[PDB]
Amino acid sequence: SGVEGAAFQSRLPHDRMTSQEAACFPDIISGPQQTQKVFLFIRNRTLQLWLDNPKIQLTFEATLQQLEAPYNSDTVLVHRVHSYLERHGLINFGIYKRIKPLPTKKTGKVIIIGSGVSGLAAARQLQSFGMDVTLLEARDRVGGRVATFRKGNYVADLGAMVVTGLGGNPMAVVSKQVNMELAKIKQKCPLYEANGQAVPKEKDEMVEQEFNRLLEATSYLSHQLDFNVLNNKPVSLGQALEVVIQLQEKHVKDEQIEHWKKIVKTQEELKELLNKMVNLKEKIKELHQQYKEASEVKPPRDITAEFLVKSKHRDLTALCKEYDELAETQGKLEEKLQELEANPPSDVYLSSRDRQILDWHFANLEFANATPLSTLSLKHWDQDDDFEFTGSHLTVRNGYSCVPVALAEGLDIKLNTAVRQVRYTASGCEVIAVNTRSTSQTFIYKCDAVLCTLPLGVLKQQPPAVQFVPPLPEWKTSAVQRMGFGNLNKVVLCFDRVFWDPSVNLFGHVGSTTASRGELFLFWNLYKAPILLALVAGEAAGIMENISDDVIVGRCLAILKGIFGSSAVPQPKETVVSRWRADPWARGSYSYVAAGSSGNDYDLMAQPITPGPSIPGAPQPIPRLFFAGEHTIRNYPATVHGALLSGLREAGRIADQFLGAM
Amino acid sequence: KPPKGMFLSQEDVEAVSANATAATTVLRQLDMELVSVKRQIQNIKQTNSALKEKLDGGIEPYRLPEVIQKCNARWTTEEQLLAVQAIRKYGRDFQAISDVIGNKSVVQVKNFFVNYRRRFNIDEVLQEWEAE
Numbered sequence: 001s002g003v004e005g006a007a008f009q010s011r012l013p014h015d016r017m018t019s020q021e022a023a024c025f026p027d028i029i030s031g032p033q034q035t036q037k038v039f040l041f042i043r044n045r046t047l048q049l050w051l052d053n054p055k056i057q058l059t060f061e062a063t064l065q066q067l068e069a070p071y072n073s074d075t076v077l078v079h080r081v082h083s084y085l086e087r088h089g090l091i092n093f094g095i096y097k098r099i100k101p102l103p104t105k106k107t108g109k110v111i112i113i114g115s116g117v118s119g120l121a122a123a124r125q126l127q128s129f130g131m132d133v134t135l136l137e138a139r140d141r142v143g144g145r146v147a148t149f150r151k152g153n154y155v156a157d158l159g160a161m162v163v164t165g166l167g168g169n170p171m172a173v174v175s176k177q178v179n180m181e182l183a184k185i186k187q188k189c190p191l192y193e194a195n196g197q198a199v200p201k202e203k204d205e206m207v208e209q210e211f212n213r214l215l216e217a218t219s220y221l222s223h224q225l226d227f228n229v230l231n232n233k234p235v236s237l238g239q240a241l242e243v244v245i246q247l248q249e250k251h252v253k254d255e256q257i258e259h260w261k262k263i264v265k266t267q268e269e270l271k272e273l274l275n276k277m278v279n280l281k282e283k284i285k286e287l288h289q290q291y292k293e294a295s296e297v298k299p300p301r302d303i304t305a306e307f308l309v310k311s312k313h314r315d316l317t318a319l320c321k322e323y324d325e326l327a328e329t330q331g332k333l334e335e336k337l338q339e340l341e342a343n344p345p346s347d348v349y350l351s352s353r354d355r356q357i358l359d360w361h362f363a364n365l366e367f368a369n370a371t372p373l374s375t376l377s378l379k380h381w382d383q384d385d386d387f388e389f390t391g392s393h394l395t396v397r398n399g400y401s402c403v404p405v406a407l408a409e410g411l412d413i414k415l416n417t418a419v420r421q422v423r424y425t426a427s428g429c430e431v432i433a434v435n436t437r438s439t440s441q442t443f444i445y446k447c448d449a450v451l452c453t454l455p456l457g458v459l460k461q462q463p464p465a466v467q468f469v470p471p472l473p474e475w476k477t478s479a480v481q482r483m484g485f486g487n488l489n490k491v492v493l494c495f496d497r498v499f500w501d502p503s504v505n506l507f508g509h510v511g512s513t514t515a516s517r518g519e520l521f522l523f524w525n526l527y528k529a530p531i532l533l534a535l536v537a538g539e540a541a542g543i544m545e546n547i548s549d550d551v552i553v554g555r556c557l558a559i560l561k562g563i564f565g566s567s568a569v570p571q572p573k574e575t576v577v578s579r580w581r582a583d584p585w586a587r588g589s590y591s592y593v594a595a596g597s598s599g600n601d602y603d604l605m606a607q608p609i610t611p612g613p614s615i616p617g618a619p620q621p622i623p624r625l626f627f628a629g630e631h632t633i634r635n636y637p638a639t640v641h642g643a644l645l646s647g648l649r650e651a652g653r654i655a656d657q658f659l660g661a662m
Numbered sequence: 663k664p665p666k667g668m669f670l671s672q673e674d675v676e677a678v679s680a681n682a683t684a685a686t687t688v689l690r691q692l693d694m695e696l697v698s699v700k701r702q703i704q705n706i707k708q709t710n711s712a713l714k715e716k717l718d719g720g721i722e723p724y725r726l727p728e729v730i731q732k733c734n735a736r737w738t739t740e741e742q743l744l745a746v747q748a749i750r751k752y753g754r755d756f757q758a759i760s761d762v763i764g765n766k767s768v769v770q771v772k773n774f775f776v777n778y779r780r781r782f783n784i785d786e787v788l789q790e791w792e793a794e
């Protein structure tokens with residue numbers, strides 16, 4: 001297909017028109033299928049071109065020069081296609097050489113709040129579109145949650161270090177434009193219990209299988225058995241796990257109960273028998289005497305007492321037939337009681353040494369979702385799973401900040417400018433920021449449109465860091481109450497001495513409690529230099545924000561002493577510590593689908609706001625206030641790509657309102 | 663539907679999820695019903711173990727050494743008379759009667775019942791077997 005591989009790489013279906021090309025080719029899609037199949041070629045081709053080299057702008061001339069007829073022919077609709085694609089950031093996004101330099105015919109002022117990837121993406125896009133864009137960032141640097149550390153030759157991302165596959169990832173393109181060295185990450189995760197001695201295969205493997213078995217179990221529990229509201233509260237993922245597990249701890253029991261209750265059916269049968277057998281042995285001891293007695297009466301004899309011997313001799317051989325059957329039929333029953341008493345139903349559901357390792361498999365989950373499983377929606381936590389990329393997960397070896405920074409080249413970024421208030425009305429918008437260094441220094445920005453990349457964390461802040469004037473409508477705010485802003489944090493351990501196993505990327509440590517599963521549950525090297533990251537997840541990470549720096553680097557070194565020995569692990573040349581929920585330009589790490597949220601909230605979060613009319617009776621205005629970043633994009637939350645996609649998007653949306661025609 | 667080795671009915675589910683406690687009721691009481699059986703097992707293991715002490719002996723001391731008496735159709739007044747008496751202790755049971763006499767086949771014993779039946783009022787020999 002190859003041209004269809006560009007559709008895939010552009011997250012579009014090569015064989016059908018999207019609900020959204022339909023948007024603005026409602027002619028083509030209303031009409032005949034030849035026209036559609038051509039449309040699609042042009043679309044996919046035009047993409048393939050951009051992709052096949054994305055470090056230079058692809059003009060309309062360029063796309064036509066490169067189309068052979070019969071597609072070469074409809075010169076107007078090739079323009080139509082190239083323009084849709086150009087706007088909506090499918091081509092000519094990120095970082096390119098511009099064949100056509102920036103016309104200084106600038107057209108509309110947009111204030112964008114925040115130099116996060118969401119922001120910078122829309123910013124560059126809007127400026128590519130010819131538009132006055134200015135960016136207002138509270139921080140002293142760009143990138144936000146794309147945050148990289150650097151002291152000397154040490155370098156390490158303190159947020160956002162993975163590329164969750166290149167297969168239809170926009171960042172694929174970006175990473176070509178910025179030449180970031182990405183490196184794969186090797187499968188192998190050695191778990192080390194509280195002592196310091198590895199878990200073996202056998203066990204390790206056993207529990208993964210169980211973990212996975214257990215999750216699938218929740219999914220059934222949800223979709224099929226329909227366990228989606230225990231007592232007018234939505235159901236946590238964690239809740240369903242506790243239930244699933246519990247039913248596995250039931251059963252295991254009833255299994256035993258049915259086995260021993262199978263033994264008694266036996267033991268008690270063999271008793272009903274041992275009685276028939278003892279009482280026969282009585283009728284026999286006795287009847288025998290009588291036949292000794294009557295046989296004693298020596299002959300000649302009359303026939304009544306010949307008959308007495310004769311008859312008693314039959315009757316005694318009857319009973320010994322009988323009793324002998326009963327002692328075949330006895331070992332038949334002491335047979336059954338070897339079989340049963342020998343191999344029994346299983347003792348336990350989970351060892352406390354296992355339920356402990358299982359806790360680490362959950363901590364890993366709490367990490368990637370950046371929240372306690374207590375909080376994830378059961379119906380919806382995995383809703384982003386249909387859209388996961390192809391390709392191996394990779395890590396940014398050279399520090400992910402290179403990307404934000406790249407994006408920021410050639411943009412008006414006011415740093416240390418902390419928006420305090422956003423006012424928006426029919427006629428335009430006023431943004432009131434302050435200088436972060438002196439809070440007293442007050443700034444006012446007037447514009448046609450505000451784009452808000454303020455983090456969900458921040459949006460949730462009470463009382464509010466930023467004030468909307470007029471306030472955001474109940475529906476939007478409600479969405480914010482609902483969604484989940486989560487948390488994780490990181491310890492960055494810089495050494496001189498590569499003491500872990502070089503061929504090993506990452507290795508767990510198993511916490512002694514459930515409550516403590518998050519604490520330094522994983523360690524990661526991925527950097528040229530001798531750096532290990534210590535990751536903190538779950539209910540844990542929330543608390544470890546309080547514990548002092550030295551204290552955390554304590555337990556860091558402790559569990560490295562365990563895993564590797566006091567001989568081997570130096571003190572560290574340099575240390576650093578996430579602590580994201582406390583950072584006030586973040587209030588956490590990333591979104592999640594809290595129980596009681598759905599993916600719809602992510603769409604509500606994207607929906608722009610349109611003010612009331614200036615003079616009552618006036619015509620319905622246009623929308624003034626827009627929203628981007630990772631909390632807006634239901635198909636790619638909590639990612640860099642998702643952010644960048646949200647930005648690409650709002651830019652297109654904004655252009656269509658303020659420049660409509662291309 | 664659920665993955666292999668995982669157990670879940672709206673029955674078993676709805677019951678670990680009523681009363682906010684009735685999970686640790688159900689799981690942590692079945693093993694009370696389990697201990698109650700593990701003891702009934704023990705009762706019978708002793709109760710039976712006792713009866714197995716009463717059979718040490720077998721019935722070896724009491725086995726009459728059953729020799730084969732080479733069959734016959736010479737129906738002696740000797741055997742004839744045993745037969746009537748056997749009819750009276752037994753009836754129907756052609757086998758026992760032949761087991762007693764020491765030479766018939768339930769053949770030859772089925773043969774007297776009917777054949778010799780004329781002469782030994784075997785009406786009144788089986789009419790006493792319907793009463794004692």
Ligand SMILES: Cc1cc2nc3c(=O)[nH]c(=O)nc-3n(C[C@H](O)[C@H](O)[C@H](O)COP(=O)(O)OP(=O)(O)OC[C@H]3O[C@@H](n4cnc5c(N)ncnc54)[C@H](O)[C@@H]3O)c2cc1C
Pocket residue numbers: 113114115116117118119136137138139142143144145146158159160161162163164417418419420453454455458465466488489578580584585586588589590628629630631638639640641643
């Ligand atoms: C620890 C961690 C690890 C992560 N790991 C990954 C990963 O491995 N892979 C992945 O794909 N994604 C990851 N993410 C997610 C990804 O980094 C973010 O989703 C992305 O940077 C979001 O960009 P954004 O533009 O939505 O918000 P942000 O990048 O936070 O930027 C928003 C900007 O708004 C600014 N701001 C906030 N308040 C104000 C104010 N009041 N006035 C003015 N400016 C303000 C902020 O300072 C910031 O610069 C991770 C996030 C975290 C926290």
Ligand SMILES: CC(C)(O)Cc1ccc(-c2ccc(C(=O)N3CC[C@@H](N)C3)cc2-c2ccc(C#N)c(F)c2)c(F)c1
Pocket residue numbers: 159160161162164189364367368369384393506522637638639
């Ligand atoms: C699985 C293992 C060994 O524990 C290491 C590993 C690898 C990838 C991820 C991962 C997977 C999917 C995703 C990811 O795409 N999602 C789905 C959306 C959101 N729910 C997260 C993110 C990560 C990831 C998240 C946070 C950090 C940090 N810091 C990181 F480095 C990688 C992970 F969480 C952990």
